[PDB]
Structure 1
Amino acid sequence: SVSEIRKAQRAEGPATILAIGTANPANCVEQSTYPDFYFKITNSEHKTELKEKFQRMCDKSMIKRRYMYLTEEILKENPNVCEYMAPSLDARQDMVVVEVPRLGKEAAVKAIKEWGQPKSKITHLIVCTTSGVDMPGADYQLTKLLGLRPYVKRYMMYQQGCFAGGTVLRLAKDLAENNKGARVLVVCSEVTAVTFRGPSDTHLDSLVGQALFGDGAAALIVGSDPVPEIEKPIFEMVWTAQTIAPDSEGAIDGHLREAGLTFHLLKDVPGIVSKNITKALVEAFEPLGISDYNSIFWIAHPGGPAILDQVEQKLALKPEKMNATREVLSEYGAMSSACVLFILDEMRKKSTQNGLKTTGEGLEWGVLFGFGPGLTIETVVLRSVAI
């Protein structure tokens, strides 16, 4: 009886990513000229030293542009958003409670189109965001916007931060694998309207966030037991882990206050990530018998370029390993949770477009990393799919 129900209820194979679709606000912000725009829009042109400092951060960022919900016209109507710290949460919340599900919606409609199956077959819905919170949440708004069934099972992940691209995958794996037929829509939608703020020379950590963060959503359809020649696997999830690096208390903290979401960097993030990445890698791939980290395909949250460079240096990865990750950093900036999902998209499209044998750059096994508050490391083990 209960064991017979349990056997009939559960799926059989590994959770598989079966579609990926992305969206970004229409406003494109060039990085090259960004320090002049940002310092003028925040009435900080008098702060010469600080500005110079910010131009060096933007030039070193390895970001060419970012898409941003916030425009100059929005910023001229919200001077409290332009100050470093002024009461402004109600204004930010009003932007992102709407923008998050609207952008989410765009991304999900593309993934759903790629998937090709009836949206009423969507059984579970994971929404993930670091901007804004609301009740009913963005999961409820998206259910309504997309026309999903009313009984879809919802997972609203609010205020998670930069590692949550790995969390959503970790979550989606167990939902798809334990429920026969389940098809998970995963939406990660991040708008920086909640974090934008003016510059202050005693809060340079906050200034780094202003050079690096950008907006965007990605959506996946995740499922086990794909219907062959009807659904088309892209990646398979095999294993996951989540861990907190030692000696990293306060490395990446973010508080939602009356003045919005503030971020504070209190340790050395690039050096904590580098120092701990090997540990993560051995815990993942030692049971797979693999020890050569240039033989797997990589996905790494690009929390800025120094994380990437210090991980590549640490392990002696060839320069090419981080190509997809850096191509996403270049074109969109760090989109918090959505970022690693754009990198899966970027990798599978490039491998397919270039005639490679797998969606994992020609390779079989892959890794995806999420880095963020705690200092937290999310690891997902992937296997590519032939062709």
Structure 2
Amino acid sequence: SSLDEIRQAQRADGPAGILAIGTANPENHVLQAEYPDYYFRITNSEHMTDLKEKFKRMCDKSTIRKRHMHLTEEFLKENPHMCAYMAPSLDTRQDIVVVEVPKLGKEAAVKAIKEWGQPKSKITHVVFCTTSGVDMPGADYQLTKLLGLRPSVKRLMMYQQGCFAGGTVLRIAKDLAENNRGARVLVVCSEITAVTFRGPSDTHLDSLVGQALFSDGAAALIVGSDPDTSVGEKPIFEMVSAAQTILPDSDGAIDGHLREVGLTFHLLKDVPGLISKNIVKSLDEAFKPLGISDWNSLFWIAHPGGPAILDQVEIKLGLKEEKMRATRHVLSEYGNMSSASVLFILDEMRRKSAKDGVATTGEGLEWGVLFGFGPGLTVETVVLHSVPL
């Protein structure tokens, strides 16, 4: 009767858990070892000898083996305004991603829902995250329609977020799941690089870095509190806390603008240096309340923005070489899929732990940390607890 009684009946009891994970990528892919030749050919830039050498080194140093790409050679031959460094092309780019982003997200979601094993009518919330295009209604609406979810799902559409948003969606889903009894949140991150792909310019080498790193993929979760074992629900990871911060002295480090030529990125500061200089402050804030100071006692998920970020974090913190294994595996096999990447890494970690027969889903350890890194410079920090295997 009272507002207080309503509130206590309305909310969930326990911590939010990741109950399922599914992933998907465009079938089409490129092998990084061959990408400099392909990219300089399809962008009609083979005369740019010195710049191609620089790009070969960038691709060789990336540690990426394979990247999935919706964009094909045959399509790009018909679309020279997308192959240019800077030609008016946003309309064509949008036409691609407003369709392909929710379609790829649906492929991941179907896999997540199958693992979860519950009827899709039990989904109560949808969180959709992309940095690839914008539209109204959003990709969240399109996904709801493609999956045939109930019309009364509570949706949140996160557009143009950037590379930290794999942490953001976990932070969002946590509050949605924990504050609503029975809530089951479908989280989807889906990224298609058709809005950022562009040709090379020897006066914009930061733009070239993105052409070596960014790739396509989608990941889907089911998140909920109070799992029901009797119907087959089983958490994989439990969320304990989620934080966000802006790093000091980082203004303008990474900017991204949506313009008539599509999405462009600009780097003005040493991003690996900024992240590694400050990450310990986020670890202390997250884990001092829990009594944890040994960062090698954690299982680790870090957004693989590029190899230098991972290398410099590992050195600064004294992490054992094994801590970044799952993260580096995803970077190697898939590249930087923006917001989806850390969700691929969670999947890789729990699958390897199960295959190996270790004691928990987090490599046999109890506590873990997940980091998103992106424009701001923004750092998202999620504390995770593993589940016994």
Q: TM-score, normalised by structure 2?
A: 0.99
Q: Kindly provide the CA deviation profile for residues 76-100 of structure 1, in whole angstroms up to 9, marking residues without a partner as x.
A: 1110000010000000000000000
Aligned partner letter, 2:326: A
Per the TM alignment, residue 28 of structure 1 is displaced from its structure 2 partner at its CA by 1.4
Summarize the alignment of residues 266-281 of structure 1 with structure 2, pairs less than 5 Å apart.
266-281=268-283
Match of 2:240 in 1: 238
Q: Kindly provide the CA deviation profile for residues 301-347 of structure 1, in whole angstroms up to 9, marking residues without a partner as x.
A: 00000000000000000000000000000000000000000000000
CA RMSD of aligned residues (A): 0.5
Per the TM alignment, residue 61 of structure 1 is displaced from its structure 2 partner at its CA by 0.2
Per the TM alignment, residue 15 of structure 1 is displaced from its structure 2 partner at its CA by 0.4
Match of 1:282 in 2: 284
Same amino acid, percent of matched pairs: 82
1:328 pairs with 2:330: yes
1-side partners of 2:278 and 2:303: how far apart? 15
Aligned partner letter, 2:169: V
Aligned partner letter, 2:50: E
1-side partners of 2:28 and 2:5: how far apart? 54
Per the TM alignment, residue 251 of structure 1 is displaced from its structure 2 partner at its CA by 1.0
Q: Kindly provide the CA deviation profile for residues 197-216 of structure 1, in whole angstroms up to 9, marking residues without a partner as x.
A: 00001100000000000000
1:34 pairs with 2:20: no
Match of 2:120 in 1: 119
2-side partners of 1:9 and 1:382: how far apart? 25
2-side partners of 1:310 and 1:203: how far apart? 24
Aligned partner letter, 1:94: D
2-side partners of 1:28 and 1:190: how far apart? 14
2-side partners of 1:354 and 1:99: how far apart? 36
Aligned partner letter, 1:30: L
SS of alignment partner, residue 105 of structure 2 = helix
SS of alignment partner, residue 295 of structure 2 = coil
Match of 2:10 in 1: 9
SS of alignment partner, residue 21 of structure 2 = strand
2-side partners of 1:316 and 1:4: how far apart? 50
Per the TM alignment, residue 252 of structure 1 is displaced from its structure 2 partner at its CA by 1.1
Summarize the alignment of residues 335-346 of structure 1 with structure 2, pairs less than 5 Å apart.
335-346=337-348
Aligned partner letter, 1:348: R
Match of 1:376 in 2: 378
Q: Kindly provide the CA deviation profile for residues 205-252 of structure 1, in whole angstroms up to 9, marking residues without a partner as x.
A: 000000000000000000000002420100000001000000111111
SS of alignment partner, residue 277 of structure 2 = helix
Match of 1:157 in 2: 158
Aligned partner letter, 1:289: G
Aligned partner letter, 2:252: G
Aligned partner letter, 2:127: I
Unaligned 5+ residue runs, structure 1? Answer: none
1-side partners of 2:370 and 2:271: how far apart? 18
Aligned partner letter, 2:373: F
1-side partners of 2:305 and 2:75: how far apart? 26
2-side partners of 1:304 and 1:242: how far apart? 20
1:62 pairs with 2:63: yes
Unaligned 5+ residue runs, structure 2? Answer: none
Match of 2:182 in 1: 181
Aligned partner letter, 1:123: T
Aligned partner letter, 1:366: G
2-side partners of 1:203 and 1:284: how far apart? 37
2-side partners of 1:254 and 1:40: how far apart? 26
SS of alignment partner, residue 113 of structure 1 = helix
2-side partners of 1:13 and 1:360: how far apart? 20
Summarize the alignment of residues 196-235 of structure 1 with structure 2, pairs less than 5 Å apart.
196-229=197-230, 230-235=232-237
Q: Which runs of 4+ in 1 moved over 2 A?
A: none
Aligned partner letter, 1:323: R
Summarize the alignment of residues 280-359 of structure 1 with structure 2, pairs less than 5 Å apart.
280-359=282-361
Aligned partner letter, 1:318: K
2-side partners of 1:202 and 1:377: how far apart? 29
Aligned partner letter, 2:13: E
Q: Kindly provide the CA deviation profile for residues 47-84 of structure 1, in whole angstroms up to 9, marking residues without a partner as x.
A: 01100000000000000010000000111111000001
SS of alignment partner, residue 33 of structure 1 = helix
Match of 1:79 in 2: 80
Residue-pair matches, total:
387
Match of 1:134 in 2: 135
Q: TM-score, normalised by structure 1?
A: 1.00
SS of alignment partner, residue 54 of structure 1 = helix
SS of alignment partner, residue 33 of structure 2 = coil
